[PDB]
Amino acid sequence: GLTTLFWLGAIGMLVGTLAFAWAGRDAGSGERRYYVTLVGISGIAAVAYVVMALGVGWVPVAERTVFAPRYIDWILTTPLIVYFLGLLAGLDSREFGIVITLNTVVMLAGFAGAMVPGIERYALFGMGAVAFLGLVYYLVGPMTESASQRSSGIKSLYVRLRNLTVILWAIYPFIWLLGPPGVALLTPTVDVALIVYLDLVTKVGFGFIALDAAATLRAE
Amino acid sequence: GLTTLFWLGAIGMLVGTLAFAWAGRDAGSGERRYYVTLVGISGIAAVAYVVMALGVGWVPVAERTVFAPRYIDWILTTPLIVYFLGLLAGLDSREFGIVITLNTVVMLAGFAGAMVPGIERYALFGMGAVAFLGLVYYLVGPMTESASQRSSGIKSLYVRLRNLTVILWAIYPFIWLLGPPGVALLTPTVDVALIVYLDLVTKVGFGFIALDAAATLRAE
Amino acid sequence: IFVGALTVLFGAIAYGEVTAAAATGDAAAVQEAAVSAILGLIILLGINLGLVA
Amino acid sequence: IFVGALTVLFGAIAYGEVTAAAATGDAAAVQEAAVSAILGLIILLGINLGLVA
Numbered sequence: 001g002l003t004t005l006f007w008l009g010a011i012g013m014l015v016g017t018l019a020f021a022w023a024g025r026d027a028g029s030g031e032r033r034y035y036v037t038l039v040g041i042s043g044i045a046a047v048a049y050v051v052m053a054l055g056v057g058w059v060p061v062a063e064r065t066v067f068a069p070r071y072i073d074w075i076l077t078t079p080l081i082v083y084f085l086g087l088l089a090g091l092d093s094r095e096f097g098i099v100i101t102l103n104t105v106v107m108l109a110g111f112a113g114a115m116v117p118g119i120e121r122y123a124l125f126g127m128g129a130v131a132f133l134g135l136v137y138y139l140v141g142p143m144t145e146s147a148s149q150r151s152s153g154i155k156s157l158y159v160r161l162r163n164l165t166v167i168l169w170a171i172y173p174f175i176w177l178l179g180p181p182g183v184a185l186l187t188p189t190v191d192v193a194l195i196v197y198l199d200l201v202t203k204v205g206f207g208f209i210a211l212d213a214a215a216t217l218r219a220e
Numbered sequence: 221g222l223t224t225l226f227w228l229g230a231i232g233m234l235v236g237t238l239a240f241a242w243a244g245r246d247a248g249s250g251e252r253r254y255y256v257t258l259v260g261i262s263g264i265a266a267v268a269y270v271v272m273a274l275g276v277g278w279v280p281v282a283e284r285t286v287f288a289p290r291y292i293d294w295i296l297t298t299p300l301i302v303y304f305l306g307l308l309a310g311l312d313s314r315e316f317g318i319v320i321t322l323n324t325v326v327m328l329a330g331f332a333g334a335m336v337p338g339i340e341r342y343a344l345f346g347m348g349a350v351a352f353l354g355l356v357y358y359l360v361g362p363m364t365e366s367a368s369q370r371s372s373g374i375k376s377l378y379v380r381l382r383n384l385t386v387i388l389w390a391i392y393p394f395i396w397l398l399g400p401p402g403v404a405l406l407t408p409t410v411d412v413a414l415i416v417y418l419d420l421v422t423k424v425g426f427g428f429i430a431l432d433a434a435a436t437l438r439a440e
Numbered sequence: 441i442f443v444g445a446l447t448v449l450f451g452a453i454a455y456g457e458v459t460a461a462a463a464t465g466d467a468a469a470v471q472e473a474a475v476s477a478i479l480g481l482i483i484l485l486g487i488n489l490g491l492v493a
Numbered sequence: 494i495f496v497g498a499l500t501v502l503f504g505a506i507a508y509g510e511v512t513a514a515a516a517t518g519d520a521a522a523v524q525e526a527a528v529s530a531i532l533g534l535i536i537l538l539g540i541n542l543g544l545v546a
């Protein structure tokens with residue numbers, strides 16, 4: 001039922017990708033980047049799910065099953081989500097560089113740990129967990145302050161997307177620890193189903209919330 | 221772990237009983253009946269849970285375990301809850317007689333069905349289910365209209381307690397069908413735990429909501 | 441926190457049954473405890489949702 | 494309805510694993526699928542709650 005779950009993830013990401021592309025067809029010169037980023041976020045995820053649905057990238061590591069495309073997906077898409085949040089917050093190059101750096105450590109850490117048999121994987125997890133707390137600090141602190149300098153509508157959207165992000169992203173590390181990568185209490189099937197749900201919400205749900213605010217922002 | 225669960229139910233009901241008795245210590249001549257009813261509702265339930273915690277009233281019927289005190293409890297306490305709701309709604313003798321009659325059919329039906337081996341138990345369940353729909357009609361229709369003739373505070377409390385009642389009571393028949401009385405998909409332990417939770421909310425939770433509104437009603 | 445704590449408590453109780461059943465070695469006994477746990481958790485969600493509403 | 498429907502879908506998937514495992518006759522295999530189902534449902538509640546919030 002794994003392939004079936006991966007196909008559902010692919011379909012969900014595809015629907016989102018198309019909706020975002022269509023919704024941004026007539027976007028102004030200032031909204032453009034936002035729509036394009038959303039397309040890239042869900043588009044790359046759709047590819048990762050298709051690759052896994054086709055049975056590619058499955059890695060039977062020390063009596064467990066980890067999926068390489070899942071982590072590759074994250075390494076490339078989460079920084080785009082952070083970029084989107086950063087654009088709303090109005091960050092400069094330096095500030096973007098800081099959060100992208102932190103985000104990348106998180107994703108590379110989970111990927112490396114997932115491929116590492118033995119207790120060493122937990123040290124790698126720790127590296128990612130600490131970087132993640134640092135990322136959360138920037139999102140709720142400095143970046144929120146930066147967002148406060150924008151319009152009420154922008155600040156409002158930033159906050160909604162940031163909350164969704166902080167709260168749901170915080171769940172992934174528990175699934176990593178409880179799933180195949182860690183103590184393997186969750187079966188590959190349950191692990192994949194929970195991630196499909198979380199991925200769809202953090203990418204497609206995230207996008208629809210932005211699309212829903214578009215008209216209000218233009219009116220401002 | 222059954223006895224442990226029954227003791228928790230007893231303790232929870234006891235705490236509620238004492239809280240309601242204490243809260244009504246200085247109740248006026250018009251609030252008195254309300255506090256007394258709450259005491260009776262949770263007090264009788266506390267006795268039923270103690271009896272079951274002591275291993276009394278357990279009935280091993282045709283490869284399943286049903287608990288006589290549970291049903292006896294319901295037959296005697298649910299009509300007191302309906303009475304409390306009826307008092308807020310301002311019902312007359314006739315109207316009280318109608319809802320109490322309907323309520324009693326529901327409880328007697330579930331009790332009889334629980335003690336009846338074979339498909340006949342489902343006909344008994346049906347009798348209770350239909351009577352229950354009739355009871356829900358009176359609660360949301362005629363009695364709500366009657367409650368609308370009272371103060372805004374009374375109507376407000378009636379509605380809150382009625383919603384809690386209609387929504388949660390509707391769950392019991394599913395637990396009956398899925399639990400030991402019906403298809404027995406839920407183990408006795410899970411069945412008892414869910415009922416302890418529902419009983420505490422429909423009686424003690426119900427009472428604390430009323431206690432919380434007391435001061436506002438007096439101010440009116 | 442309330443619903444969350446309770447859901448955890450219920451899961452623990454459910455887990456206790458599964459574990460106890462597993463100790464017997466009877467796959468059917470484990471299945472029974474498991475189906476019960478799953479249906480119980482779903483009902484618990486119904487209760488919690490109804491309460492919130 | 495959304496969270497409710499999904500919780501039902503998840504339970505069904507979880508049930509599928511328990512049932513499949515039971516077919517083998519290995520009490521340990523059933524236990525593994527069951528613990529997974531229980532923990533999964535609890536996490537699902539976390540997700541749903543986080544989403545609502």
Ligand SMILES: *C/C=C(C)/C=C/C=C(C)/C=C/C1=C(C)CCCC1(C)C
Binds near residue numbers: 077125170199
């Ligand atoms: C599109 C998919 C998303 C939004 C994925 C988010 C993934 C995370 C927030 C993962 C976090 C992890 C940690 C904090 C610790 C190390 C292990 C990870 C990679 C599971």
Ligand SMILES: *C/C=C(C)/C=C/C=C(C)/C=C/C1=C(C)CCCC1(C)C
Binds near residue numbers: 297330349
């Ligand atoms: C204090 C305990 C309470 C509020 C118990 C409420 C019980 C019910 C609403 C039971 C209802 C049933 C049906 C509608 C159909 C037949 C079987 C029952 C008795 C489980």
Ligand SMILES: CCCCCCCCO[C@@H]1O[C@H](CO)[C@@H](O)[C@H](O)[C@H]1O
Binds near residue numbers: 030031087211214
């Ligand atoms: C569907 C997603 C719609 C996102 C709309 C985001 C609107 C943010 O607002 C835009 O931010 C830009 C930042 O450089 C500014 O240059 C634009 O003038 C401003 O309108």
Ligand SMILES: CCCCCCCCO[C@@H]1O[C@H](CO)[C@@H](O)[C@H](O)[C@H]1O
Binds near residue numbers: 251255433
């Ligand atoms: C803790 C529970 C407190 C319940 C307070 C209910 C107050 C309802 O209000 C009371 O209803 C009576 C009905 O006969 C009237 O006679 C009283 O005058 C009126 O104050």
